[PDB]
mmCIF file of C-alpha atoms in Angstrom:
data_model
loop_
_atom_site.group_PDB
_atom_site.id
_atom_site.type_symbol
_atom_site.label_atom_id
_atom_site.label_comp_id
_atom_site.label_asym_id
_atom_site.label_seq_id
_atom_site.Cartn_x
_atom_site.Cartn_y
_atom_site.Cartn_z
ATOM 1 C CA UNK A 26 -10.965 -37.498 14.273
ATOM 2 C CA UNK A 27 -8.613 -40.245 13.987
ATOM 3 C CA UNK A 28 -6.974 -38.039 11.262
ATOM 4 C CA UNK A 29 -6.700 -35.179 13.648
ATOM 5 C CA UNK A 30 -5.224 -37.471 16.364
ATOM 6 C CA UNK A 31 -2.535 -39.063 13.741
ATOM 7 C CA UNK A 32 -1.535 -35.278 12.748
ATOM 8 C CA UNK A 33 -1.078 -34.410 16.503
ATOM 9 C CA UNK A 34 1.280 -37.575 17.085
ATOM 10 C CA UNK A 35 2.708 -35.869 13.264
ATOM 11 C CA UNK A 36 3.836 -32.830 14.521
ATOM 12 C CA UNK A 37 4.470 -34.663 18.233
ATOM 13 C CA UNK A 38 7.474 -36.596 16.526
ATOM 14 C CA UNK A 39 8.151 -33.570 15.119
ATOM 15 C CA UNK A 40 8.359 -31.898 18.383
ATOM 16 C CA UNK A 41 10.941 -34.061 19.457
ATOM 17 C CA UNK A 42 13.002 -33.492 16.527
ATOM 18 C CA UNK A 43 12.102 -30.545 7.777
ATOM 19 C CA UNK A 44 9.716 -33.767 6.402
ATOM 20 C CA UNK A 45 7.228 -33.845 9.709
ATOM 21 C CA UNK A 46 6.727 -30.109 8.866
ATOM 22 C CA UNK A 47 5.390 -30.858 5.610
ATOM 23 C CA UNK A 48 3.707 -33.174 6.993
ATOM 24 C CA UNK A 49 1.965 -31.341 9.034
ATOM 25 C CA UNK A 50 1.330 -29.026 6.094
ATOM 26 C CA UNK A 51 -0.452 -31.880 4.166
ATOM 27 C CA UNK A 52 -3.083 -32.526 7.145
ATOM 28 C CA UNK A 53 -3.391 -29.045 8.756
ATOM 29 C CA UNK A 54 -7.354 -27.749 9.367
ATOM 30 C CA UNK A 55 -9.180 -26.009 12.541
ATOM 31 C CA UNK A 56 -9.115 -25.714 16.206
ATOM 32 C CA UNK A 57 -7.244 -28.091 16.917
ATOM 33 C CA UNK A 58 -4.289 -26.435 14.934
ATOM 34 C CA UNK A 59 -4.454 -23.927 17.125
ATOM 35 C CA UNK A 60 -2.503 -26.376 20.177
ATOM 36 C CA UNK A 61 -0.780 -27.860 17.175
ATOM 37 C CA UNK A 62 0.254 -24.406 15.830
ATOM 38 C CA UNK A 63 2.048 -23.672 19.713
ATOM 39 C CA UNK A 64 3.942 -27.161 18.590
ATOM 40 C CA UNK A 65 5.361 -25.730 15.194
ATOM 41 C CA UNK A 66 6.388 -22.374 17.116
ATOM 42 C CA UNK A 67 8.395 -24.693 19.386
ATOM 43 C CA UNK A 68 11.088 -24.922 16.507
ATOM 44 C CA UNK A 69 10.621 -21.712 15.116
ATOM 45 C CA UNK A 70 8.285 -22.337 12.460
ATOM 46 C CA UNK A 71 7.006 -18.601 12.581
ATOM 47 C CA UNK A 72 6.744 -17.963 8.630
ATOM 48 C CA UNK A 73 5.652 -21.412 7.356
ATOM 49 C CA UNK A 74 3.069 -21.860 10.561
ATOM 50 C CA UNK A 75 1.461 -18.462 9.084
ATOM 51 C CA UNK A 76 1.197 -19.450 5.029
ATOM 52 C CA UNK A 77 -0.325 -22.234 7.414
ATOM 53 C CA UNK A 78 -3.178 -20.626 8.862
ATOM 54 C CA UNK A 79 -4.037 -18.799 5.771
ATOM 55 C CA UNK A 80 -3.659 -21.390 3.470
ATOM 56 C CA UNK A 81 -6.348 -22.804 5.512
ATOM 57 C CA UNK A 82 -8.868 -19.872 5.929
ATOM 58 C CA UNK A 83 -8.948 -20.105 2.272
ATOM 59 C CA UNK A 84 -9.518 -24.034 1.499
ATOM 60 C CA UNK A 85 -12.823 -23.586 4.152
ATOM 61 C CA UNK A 86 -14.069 -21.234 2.088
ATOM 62 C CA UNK A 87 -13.191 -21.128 -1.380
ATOM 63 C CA UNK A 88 -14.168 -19.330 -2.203
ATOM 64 C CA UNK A 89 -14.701 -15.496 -1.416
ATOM 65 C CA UNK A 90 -18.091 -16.171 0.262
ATOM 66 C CA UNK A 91 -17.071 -14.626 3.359
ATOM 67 C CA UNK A 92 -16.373 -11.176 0.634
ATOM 68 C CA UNK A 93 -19.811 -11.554 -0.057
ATOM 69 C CA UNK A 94 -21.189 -11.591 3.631
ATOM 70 C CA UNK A 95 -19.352 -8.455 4.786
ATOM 71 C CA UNK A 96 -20.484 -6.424 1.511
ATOM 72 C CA UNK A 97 -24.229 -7.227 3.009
ATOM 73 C CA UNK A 98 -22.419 -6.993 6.178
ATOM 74 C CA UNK A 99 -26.240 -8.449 7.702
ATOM 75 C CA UNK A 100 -26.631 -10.320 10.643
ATOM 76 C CA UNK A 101 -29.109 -12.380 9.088
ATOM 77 C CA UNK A 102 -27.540 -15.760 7.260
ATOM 78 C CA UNK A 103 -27.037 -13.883 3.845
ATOM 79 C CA UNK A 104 -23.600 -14.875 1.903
ATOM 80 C CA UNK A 105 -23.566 -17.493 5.014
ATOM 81 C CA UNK A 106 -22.043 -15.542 7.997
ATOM 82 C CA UNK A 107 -20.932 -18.549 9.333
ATOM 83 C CA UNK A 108 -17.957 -18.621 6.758
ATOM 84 C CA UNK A 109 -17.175 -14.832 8.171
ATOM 85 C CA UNK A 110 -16.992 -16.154 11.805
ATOM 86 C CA UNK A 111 -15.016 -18.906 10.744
ATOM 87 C CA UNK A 112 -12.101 -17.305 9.159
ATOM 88 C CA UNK A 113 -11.942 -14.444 11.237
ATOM 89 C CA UNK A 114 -10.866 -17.290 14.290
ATOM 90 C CA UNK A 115 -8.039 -18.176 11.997
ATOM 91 C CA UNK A 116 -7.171 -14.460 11.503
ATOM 92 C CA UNK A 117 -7.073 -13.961 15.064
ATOM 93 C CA UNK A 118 -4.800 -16.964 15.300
ATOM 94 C CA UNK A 119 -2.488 -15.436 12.515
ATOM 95 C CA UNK A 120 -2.415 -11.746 14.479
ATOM 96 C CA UNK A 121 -2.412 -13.999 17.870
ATOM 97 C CA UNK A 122 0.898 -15.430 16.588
ATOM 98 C CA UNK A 123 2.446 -12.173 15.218
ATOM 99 C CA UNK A 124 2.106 -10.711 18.386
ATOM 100 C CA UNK A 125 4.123 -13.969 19.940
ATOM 101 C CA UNK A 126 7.330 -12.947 17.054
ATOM 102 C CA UNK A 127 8.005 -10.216 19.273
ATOM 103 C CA UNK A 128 14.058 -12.471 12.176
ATOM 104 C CA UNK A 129 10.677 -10.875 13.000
ATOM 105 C CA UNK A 130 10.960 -9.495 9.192
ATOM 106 C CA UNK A 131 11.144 -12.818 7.145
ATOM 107 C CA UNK A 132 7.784 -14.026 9.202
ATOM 108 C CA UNK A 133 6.123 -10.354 8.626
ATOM 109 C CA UNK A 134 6.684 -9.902 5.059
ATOM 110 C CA UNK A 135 5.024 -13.270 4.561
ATOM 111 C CA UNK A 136 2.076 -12.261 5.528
ATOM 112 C CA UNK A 137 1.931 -9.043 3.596
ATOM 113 C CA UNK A 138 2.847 -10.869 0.747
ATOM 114 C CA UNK A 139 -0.110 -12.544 0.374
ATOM 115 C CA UNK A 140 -3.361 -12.142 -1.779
ATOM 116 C CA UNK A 141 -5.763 -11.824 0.464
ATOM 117 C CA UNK A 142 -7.782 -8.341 0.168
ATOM 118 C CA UNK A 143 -10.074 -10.150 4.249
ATOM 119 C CA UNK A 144 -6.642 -11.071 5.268
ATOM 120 C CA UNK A 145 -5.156 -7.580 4.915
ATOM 121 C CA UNK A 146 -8.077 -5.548 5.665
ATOM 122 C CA UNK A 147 -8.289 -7.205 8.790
ATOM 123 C CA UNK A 148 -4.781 -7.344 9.376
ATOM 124 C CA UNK A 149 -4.483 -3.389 9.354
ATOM 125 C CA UNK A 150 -7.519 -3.279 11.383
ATOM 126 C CA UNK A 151 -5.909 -5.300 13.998
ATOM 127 C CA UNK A 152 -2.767 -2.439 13.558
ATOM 128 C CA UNK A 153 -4.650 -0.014 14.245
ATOM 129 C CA UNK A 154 -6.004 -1.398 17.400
ATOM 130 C CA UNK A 155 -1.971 -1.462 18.418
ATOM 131 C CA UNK A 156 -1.715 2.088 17.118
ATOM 132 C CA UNK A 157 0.714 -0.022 14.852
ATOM 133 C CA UNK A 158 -0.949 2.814 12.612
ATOM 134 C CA UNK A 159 2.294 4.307 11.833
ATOM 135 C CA UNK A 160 3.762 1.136 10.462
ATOM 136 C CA UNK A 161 0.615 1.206 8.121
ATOM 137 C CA UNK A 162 1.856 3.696 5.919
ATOM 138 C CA UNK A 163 4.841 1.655 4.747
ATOM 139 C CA UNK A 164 3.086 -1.542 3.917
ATOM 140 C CA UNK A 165 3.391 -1.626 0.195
ATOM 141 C CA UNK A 166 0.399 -3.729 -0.214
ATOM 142 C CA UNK A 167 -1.734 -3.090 -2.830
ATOM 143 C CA UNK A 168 -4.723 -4.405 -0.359
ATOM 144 C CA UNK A 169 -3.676 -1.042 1.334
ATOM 145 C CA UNK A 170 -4.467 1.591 -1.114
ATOM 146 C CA UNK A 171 -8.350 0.770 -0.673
ATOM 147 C CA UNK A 172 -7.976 -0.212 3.188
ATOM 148 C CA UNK A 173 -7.087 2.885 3.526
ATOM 149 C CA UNK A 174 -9.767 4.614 1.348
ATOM 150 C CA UNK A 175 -12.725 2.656 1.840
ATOM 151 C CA UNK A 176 -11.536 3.429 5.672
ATOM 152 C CA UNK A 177 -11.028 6.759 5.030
ATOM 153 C CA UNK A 178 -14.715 8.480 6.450
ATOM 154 C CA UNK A 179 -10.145 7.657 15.035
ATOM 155 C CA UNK A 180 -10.470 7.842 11.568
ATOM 156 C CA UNK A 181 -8.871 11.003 11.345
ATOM 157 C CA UNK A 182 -5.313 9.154 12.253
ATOM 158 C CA UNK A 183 -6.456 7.416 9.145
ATOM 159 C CA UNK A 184 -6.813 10.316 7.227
ATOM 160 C CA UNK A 185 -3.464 11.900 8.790
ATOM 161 C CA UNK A 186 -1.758 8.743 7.778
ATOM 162 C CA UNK A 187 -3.523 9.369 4.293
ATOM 163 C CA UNK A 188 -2.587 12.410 3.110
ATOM 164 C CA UNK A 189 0.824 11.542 4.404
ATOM 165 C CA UNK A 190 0.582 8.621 2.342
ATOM 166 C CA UNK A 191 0.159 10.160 -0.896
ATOM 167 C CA UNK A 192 3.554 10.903 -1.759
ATOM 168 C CA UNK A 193 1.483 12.531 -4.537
ATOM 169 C CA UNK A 194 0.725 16.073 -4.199
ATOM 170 C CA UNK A 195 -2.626 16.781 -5.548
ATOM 171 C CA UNK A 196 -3.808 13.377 -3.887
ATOM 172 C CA UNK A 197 -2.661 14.568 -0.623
ATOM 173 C CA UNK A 198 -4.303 17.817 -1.357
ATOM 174 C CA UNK A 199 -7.170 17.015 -1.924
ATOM 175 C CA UNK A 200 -7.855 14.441 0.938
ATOM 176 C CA UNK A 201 -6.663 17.508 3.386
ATOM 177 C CA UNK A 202 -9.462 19.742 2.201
ATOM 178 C CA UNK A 203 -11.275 17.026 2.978
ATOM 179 C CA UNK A 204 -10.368 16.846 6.637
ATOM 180 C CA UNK A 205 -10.690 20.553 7.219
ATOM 181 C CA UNK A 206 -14.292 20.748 4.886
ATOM 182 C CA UNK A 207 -15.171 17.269 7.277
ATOM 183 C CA UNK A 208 -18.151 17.601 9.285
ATOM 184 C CA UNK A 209 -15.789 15.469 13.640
ATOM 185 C CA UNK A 210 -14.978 18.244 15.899
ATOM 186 C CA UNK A 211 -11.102 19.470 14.181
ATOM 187 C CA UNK A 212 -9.619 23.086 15.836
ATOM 188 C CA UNK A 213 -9.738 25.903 13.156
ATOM 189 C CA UNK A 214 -5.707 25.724 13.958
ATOM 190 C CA UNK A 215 -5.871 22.335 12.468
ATOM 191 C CA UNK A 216 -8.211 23.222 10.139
ATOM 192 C CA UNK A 217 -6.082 26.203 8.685
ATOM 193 C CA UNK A 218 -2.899 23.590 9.201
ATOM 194 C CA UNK A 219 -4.629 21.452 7.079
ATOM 195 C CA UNK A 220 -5.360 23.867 4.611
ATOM 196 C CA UNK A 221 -1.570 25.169 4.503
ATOM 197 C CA UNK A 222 -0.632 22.159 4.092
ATOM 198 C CA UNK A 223 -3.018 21.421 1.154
ATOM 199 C CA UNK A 224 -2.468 24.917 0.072
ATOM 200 C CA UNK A 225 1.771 24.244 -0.197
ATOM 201 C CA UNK A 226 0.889 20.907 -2.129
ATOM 202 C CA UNK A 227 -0.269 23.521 -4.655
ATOM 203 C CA UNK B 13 23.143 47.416 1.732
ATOM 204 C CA UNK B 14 26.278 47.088 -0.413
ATOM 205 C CA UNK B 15 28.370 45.736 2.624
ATOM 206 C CA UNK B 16 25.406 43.931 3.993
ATOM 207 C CA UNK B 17 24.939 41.643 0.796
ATOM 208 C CA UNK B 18 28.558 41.484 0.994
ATOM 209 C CA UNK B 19 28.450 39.749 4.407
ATOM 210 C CA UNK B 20 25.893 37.729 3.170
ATOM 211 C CA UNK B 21 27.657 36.099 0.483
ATOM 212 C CA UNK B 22 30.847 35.473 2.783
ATOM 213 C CA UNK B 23 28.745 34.268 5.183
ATOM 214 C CA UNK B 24 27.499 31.373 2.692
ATOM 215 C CA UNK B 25 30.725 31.134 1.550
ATOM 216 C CA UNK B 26 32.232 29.977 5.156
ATOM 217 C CA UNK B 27 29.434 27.783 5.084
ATOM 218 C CA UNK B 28 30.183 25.965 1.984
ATOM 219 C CA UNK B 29 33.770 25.771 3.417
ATOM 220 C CA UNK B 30 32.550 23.268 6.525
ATOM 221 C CA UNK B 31 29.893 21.923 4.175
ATOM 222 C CA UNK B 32 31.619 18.186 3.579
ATOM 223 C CA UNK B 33 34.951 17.870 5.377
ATOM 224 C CA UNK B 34 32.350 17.082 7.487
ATOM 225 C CA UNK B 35 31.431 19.712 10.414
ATOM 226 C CA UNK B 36 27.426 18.829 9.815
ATOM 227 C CA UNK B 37 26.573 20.141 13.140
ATOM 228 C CA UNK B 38 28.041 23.337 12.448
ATOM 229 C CA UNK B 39 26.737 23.890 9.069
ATOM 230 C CA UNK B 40 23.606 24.184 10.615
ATOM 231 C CA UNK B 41 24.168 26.626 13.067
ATOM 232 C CA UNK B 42 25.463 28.841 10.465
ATOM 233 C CA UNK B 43 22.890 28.658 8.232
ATOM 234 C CA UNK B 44 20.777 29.498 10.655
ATOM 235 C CA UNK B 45 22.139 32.239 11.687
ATOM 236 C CA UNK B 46 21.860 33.842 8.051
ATOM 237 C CA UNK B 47 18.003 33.849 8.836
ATOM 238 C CA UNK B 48 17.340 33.541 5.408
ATOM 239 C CA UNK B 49 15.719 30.378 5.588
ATOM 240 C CA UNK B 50 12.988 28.990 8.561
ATOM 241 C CA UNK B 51 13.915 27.003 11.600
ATOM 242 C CA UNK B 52 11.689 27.930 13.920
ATOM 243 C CA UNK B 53 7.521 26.933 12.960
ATOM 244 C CA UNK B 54 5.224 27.341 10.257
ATOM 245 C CA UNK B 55 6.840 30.781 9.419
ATOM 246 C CA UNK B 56 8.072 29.212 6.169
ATOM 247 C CA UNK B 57 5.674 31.555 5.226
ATOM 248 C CA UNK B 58 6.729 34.625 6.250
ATOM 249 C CA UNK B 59 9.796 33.799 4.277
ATOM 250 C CA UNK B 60 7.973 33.787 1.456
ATOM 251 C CA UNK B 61 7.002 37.307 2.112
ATOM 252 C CA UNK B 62 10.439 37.881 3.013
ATOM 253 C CA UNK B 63 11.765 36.034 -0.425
ATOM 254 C CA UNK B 64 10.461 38.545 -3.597
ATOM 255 C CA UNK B 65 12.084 41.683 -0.987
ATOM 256 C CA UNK B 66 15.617 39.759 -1.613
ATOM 257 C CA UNK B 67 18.121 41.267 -3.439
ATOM 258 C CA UNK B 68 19.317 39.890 -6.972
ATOM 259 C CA UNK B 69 22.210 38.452 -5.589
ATOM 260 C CA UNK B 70 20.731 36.153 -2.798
ATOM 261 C CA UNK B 71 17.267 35.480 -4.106
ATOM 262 C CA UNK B 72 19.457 33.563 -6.773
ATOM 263 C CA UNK B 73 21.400 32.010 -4.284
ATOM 264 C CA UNK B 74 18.581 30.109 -2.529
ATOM 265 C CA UNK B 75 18.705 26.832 -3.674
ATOM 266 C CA UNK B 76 21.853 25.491 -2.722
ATOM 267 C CA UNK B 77 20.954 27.034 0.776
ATOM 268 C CA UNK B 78 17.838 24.735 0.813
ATOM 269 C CA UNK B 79 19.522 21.169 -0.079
ATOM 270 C CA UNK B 80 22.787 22.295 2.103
ATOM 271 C CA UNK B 81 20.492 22.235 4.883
ATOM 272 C CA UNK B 82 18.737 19.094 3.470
ATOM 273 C CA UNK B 83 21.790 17.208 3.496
ATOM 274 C CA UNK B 84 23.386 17.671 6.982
ATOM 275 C CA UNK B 85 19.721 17.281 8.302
ATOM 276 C CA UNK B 86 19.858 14.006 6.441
ATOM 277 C CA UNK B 87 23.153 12.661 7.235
ATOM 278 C CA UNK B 88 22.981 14.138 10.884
ATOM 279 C CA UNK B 89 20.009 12.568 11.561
ATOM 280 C CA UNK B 90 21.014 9.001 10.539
ATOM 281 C CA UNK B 91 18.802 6.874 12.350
ATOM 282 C CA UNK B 92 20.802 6.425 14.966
ATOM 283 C CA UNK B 93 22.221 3.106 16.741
ATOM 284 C CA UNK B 94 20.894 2.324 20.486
ATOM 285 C CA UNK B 95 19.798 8.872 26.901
ATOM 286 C CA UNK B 96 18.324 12.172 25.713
ATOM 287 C CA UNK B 97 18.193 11.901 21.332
ATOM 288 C CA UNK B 98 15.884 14.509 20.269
ATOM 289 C CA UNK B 99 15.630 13.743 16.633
ATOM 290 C CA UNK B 100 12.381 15.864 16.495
ATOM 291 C CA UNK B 101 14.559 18.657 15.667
ATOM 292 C CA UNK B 102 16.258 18.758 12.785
ATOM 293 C CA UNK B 103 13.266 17.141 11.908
ATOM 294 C CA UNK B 104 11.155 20.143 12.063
ATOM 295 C CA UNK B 105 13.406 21.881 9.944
ATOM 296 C CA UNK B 106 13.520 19.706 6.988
ATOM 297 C CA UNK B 107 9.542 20.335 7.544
ATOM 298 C CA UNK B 108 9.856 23.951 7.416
ATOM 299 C CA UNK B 109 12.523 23.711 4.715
ATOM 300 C CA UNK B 110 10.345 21.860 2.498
ATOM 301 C CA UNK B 111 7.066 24.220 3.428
ATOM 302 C CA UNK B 112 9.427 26.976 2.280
ATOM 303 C CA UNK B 113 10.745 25.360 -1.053
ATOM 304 C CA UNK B 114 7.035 23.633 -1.690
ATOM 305 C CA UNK B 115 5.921 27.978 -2.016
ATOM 306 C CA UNK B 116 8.600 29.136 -3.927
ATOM 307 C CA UNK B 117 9.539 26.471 -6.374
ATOM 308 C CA UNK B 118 8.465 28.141 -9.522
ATOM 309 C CA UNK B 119 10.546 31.296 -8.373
ATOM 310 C CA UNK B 120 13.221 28.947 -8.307
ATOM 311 C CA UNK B 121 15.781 26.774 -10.968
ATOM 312 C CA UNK B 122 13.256 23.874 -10.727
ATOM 313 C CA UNK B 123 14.884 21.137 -8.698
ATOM 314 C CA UNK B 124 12.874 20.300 -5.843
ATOM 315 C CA UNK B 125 14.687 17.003 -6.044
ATOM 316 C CA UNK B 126 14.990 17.740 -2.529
ATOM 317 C CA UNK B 127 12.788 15.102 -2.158
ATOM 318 C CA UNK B 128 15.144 13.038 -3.069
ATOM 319 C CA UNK B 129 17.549 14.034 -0.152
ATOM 320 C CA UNK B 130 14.244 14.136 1.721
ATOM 321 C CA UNK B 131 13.965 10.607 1.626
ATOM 322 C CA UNK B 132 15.638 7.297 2.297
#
């Protein structure tokens, strides 16, 4: 409350002129960081505001309940779902706020550099959406390895962009077989393109 | 089929002579025109049916003619700067290329670092 108000008139002095940005590090925490986050974007405080948000998704809930809820995935309190809805706000805020980048690199990379598995998985989920999809197959990640095959049953642009991501032959083989074997609606053409494909990866 | 293998080998030959001191563009077109190797689709294939036929002389000759090709594909298609750019082609071709030299690699020296041209 009072806290929240002395952070505002924190980052306020800060808006009118590096120190009130840490200070605003020390006291940052929910919804109302989302006005104060429009303040640190006023002097381009793109990377650190995103470290930011995350740091913050993860002191709520420290730690990995929210893991826990999706695995159930129920709609019934199991772990608590409330931890789930919680985070996923801040998430949006963090995807909200790489849309607004468009030195977009320096505030990317710190995201993808980050350990965090709900981050990332929802991160390339919110790609996706964007048909950002192509981008997906250079992250580096190593979150992305099992987005991408947990995903992997428009999932066929998935698959496409799996396949393609092996740089491994019998990897990318064998996920092609896949997609022609696959029970959603793919022309024979395809089918057979699949299979040469697979076939050259021989 | 003396003279023709004859022509074959020059042909390469005047190929090598505009591959580097530059003249990308036109080592293309040449090696096209040898119709050894596939620019058009898929037909990589047929090439490999068209590939055991081959003489001696040329079926040995076959690798530097893939890599040539991957090479001024690569450094013709540098991602260009900032309009009609249709880097699709030239595209294909590496596609087909690599189709082609994926089938017959065992049939060949054994250096499909092509990949490594392939790539950047």
């Amino acid at each position: 409350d009072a806290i929240c108000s002395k952070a505002n008139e924190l980052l306020q002095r800060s808006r009118q002129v590096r120190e009130s940005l840490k200070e605003y590090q020390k006291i940052s925490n929910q919804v109302d960081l989302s006005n104060v986050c429009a303040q640190y974007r006023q002097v381009r405080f793109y990377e650190g505001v995103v470290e930011l948000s995350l740091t913050a998704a993860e002191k709520k809930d420290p730690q990995g309940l929210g893991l826990h809820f999706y695995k159930h995935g129920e709609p019934e309190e199991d772990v608590g779902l409330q931890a789930f809805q919680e985070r996923l706000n801040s998430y949006k805020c963090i995807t909200d706020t790489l849309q607004e980048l468009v030195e977009a690199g320096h505030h990317f990379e710190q995201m993808l550099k980050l350990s965090q598995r709900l981050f990332s998985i929802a991160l390339y989920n919110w790609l996706i959406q964007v048909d950002l999809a192509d981008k997906l197959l250079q992250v580096a990640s190593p979150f992305l390895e099992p987005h991408l095959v947990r995903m992997a049953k428009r999932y066929m642009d998935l698959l496409w962009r799996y396949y393609e991501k092996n740089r491994s032959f019998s990897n990318a083989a064998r996920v092609l077989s896949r997609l022609a074997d696959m029970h959603t609606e793919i022309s024979l053409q395809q089918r057979l393109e699949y299979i040469a494909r697979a076939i050259l990866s021989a | 089929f003396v003279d023709s293998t004859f022509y074959l080998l020059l042909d390469l030959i005047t190929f090598f002579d505009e591959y580097h001191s530059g003249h990308i563009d036109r080592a293309f077109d040449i090696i096209e025109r040898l119709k050894l190797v596939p620019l058009n689709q898929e037909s990589v294939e047929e090439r490999v049916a068209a590939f055991r036929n081959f003489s001696d002389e040329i079926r040995h000759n076959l690798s530097e003619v893939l890599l040539a090709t991957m090479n001024i594909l690569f450094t013709q298609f540098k991602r260009l700067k900032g309009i009609e750019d249709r880097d699709s082609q030239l595209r294909s071709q590496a596609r087909t290329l690599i189709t082609f030299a994926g089938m017959i690699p065992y049939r060949t020296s054994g250096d499909t670092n092509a990949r490594l041209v392939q790539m950047e």
